[PDB]
Amino acid sequence: DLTANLMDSVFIDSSGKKSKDKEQIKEKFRKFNEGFEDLVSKTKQYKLSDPSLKVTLKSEIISLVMPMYERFYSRYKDSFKNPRKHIKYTPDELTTVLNQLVR
């Protein structure tokens, strides 16, 4: 769902200009962070027992998320002098979050 309406949020505003609709910047990127930390939050409820399930769900959801944020992060990282105040994560640090989502 997160990846779904993330790249759908790319799709619906794929029509016009660069995001002078900065509600689209903080729409896609803020609500992406919202649902991302919702998913990390409810990931904490469950603690796995098979190590190969840890590898499995780990690399599955990594392969689900990443290239969207690669082409999309890297597509839209050119909007402010501090995108920091609108966009939060690298793929480096988000990758690290996923890699310590799986303790």
């Binding site: 930390e37 990390v40 939050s41 501090n82 105040k85 979050v97």
Partner: protein
């Protein structure tokens, strides 16, 4: 109208300090995980601002 480069140096060494204090005021955005145990507010201290 030119030049006297002590203009230009002090034109820098505050702009960078603006960037660092930008990275202490706006420091508390990027952490940012659940619970949320969000132990610092991203736009916090209006008094101290």
């Amino acid at each position: 109208f030119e030049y006297g480069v002590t203009q230009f140096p002090e034109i820098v060494t505050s702009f960078q300090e603006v960037s660092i204090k930008t990275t202490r005021d706006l420091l508390f955005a990027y952490e940012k995980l659940p619970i949320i145990n969000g132990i610092s507010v991203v736009s916090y201290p209006s008094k101290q601002l």
